[PDB]
Design a protein around this ligand. Sequence first.
Ligand SMILES: [Zn+2]
Ligand SMILES: [Zn+2]
Lengths: 234, 284
Amino acid sequence: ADLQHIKHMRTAVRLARYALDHDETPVACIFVHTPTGQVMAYGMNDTNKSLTGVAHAEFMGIDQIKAMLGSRGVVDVFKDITLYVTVEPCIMCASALKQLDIGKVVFGCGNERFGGNGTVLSVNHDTCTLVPKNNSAAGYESIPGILRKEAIMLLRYFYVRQNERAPNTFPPMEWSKYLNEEAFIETFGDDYRTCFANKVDLSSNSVDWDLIDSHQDNIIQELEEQCKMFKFNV
Amino acid sequence: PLKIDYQNGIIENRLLQIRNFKDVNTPKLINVWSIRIDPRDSKKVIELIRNDFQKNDPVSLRHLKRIEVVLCDEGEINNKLKSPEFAPSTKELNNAWSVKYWPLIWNGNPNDQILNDYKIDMQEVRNELSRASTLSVKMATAGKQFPMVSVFVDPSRKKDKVVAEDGRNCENSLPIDHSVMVGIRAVGERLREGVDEDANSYLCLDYDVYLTHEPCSMCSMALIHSRVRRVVFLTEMQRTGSLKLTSGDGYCMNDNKQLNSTYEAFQWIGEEYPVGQVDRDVCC
Ligand SMILES: [Zn+2]
Ligand SMILES: [Zn+2]
């Protein structure tokens, strides 16, 4: 419930919306350099172009950083990065992010079938997925539920849209999969704290319709300018 | 055809079946989409719900003693105008689940039917494994610090097998450039080029994959997304492996009911095909 988190997730949601409108799954990434508050890379699902089942948002953003900074660059900077994703990283992405030693993940809605930050596995706090520098597994935090409703709604749009081819009620939020009540209240306010962790319900009260219903065709050009600014600040 | 040791899940003294036992104890339920009738209707409905409801349902409900009957709204009542997602492993578990949720048909350990249905070409397996291993030792002999190999065979066996060395040996590499990932990207780029791929090529669907080393959590899940049929590996990685029950945190990613998808997995437990020593902390 930090406001930088709202800000950056809003960006992620705009990008996911763009993904929806280009016939792709609305999972989208914003890699933020936490010490400066700067947007350093972005991602969208890209399995339509790649024809592989591995070209996920996070992967796209890892490539962008590798291109901007080189391999050494990626490995060096990554511990300083806060990732913002609309949907919880899948096990595969959660594991890649673990191995690269990411600072932190903030996500919207859980990933019901493949979620590797608590929903199906907790790769981010496991013991078999290591940081190679020192073969460690201290882990990373993954903050759930930031614009959860928005992420869920974008997915519903996708499911409906997907069917167009040639021939509110949001689920209970099992928060205890992603943090302990103490870790909840350190993460969120004490008012929202008690009530929300307790009743298995979402932090918010109305769906931001303008954000998810309006198109974002300029989003790429916006993120490009912002990314190149970060590059000139390096 | 094949010698099966049903006791231990070892095929031909060499292929050790890899799957999960902890999770086979608990039941993963569904709701009862029931139907109530009297016996005369029963025989007519069981015909209708037999041919379509078994032939068409994406779930496999053949372990359910369907007699107080459930086919599996529009297509359902149109045809009806005429008038444990998974089996348990023990008889005890069968009887208890029978009364807890629904009568089930007990037909022995369902893993016995799985081992029997495994269609395996023993010589192909040996071949690919010999190939990956010989490369592995070459790589090690060459000083390469990540002497791991993945070999991707397509369903038809007519395309060129894709041979993928670990990327962390290469110049501009990331810690996540593991051999399974590389081979997956290679198959993808082969589809993208389109010279040797039909319009019914999709992902690595029904590919078999041969690894010198048990894959990490990223790679395991990566093969789930790529919809491969089978993985066969040589070296277990207790610290990092994500297939064997006793490797890693027991992810058993090939055989996790919570995902919608599985693949068959085997370890080779003979000594014929030695590989390059890898540090045990290495993911992959
Ligand atoms: Zn993913
Ligand atoms: Zn791996």
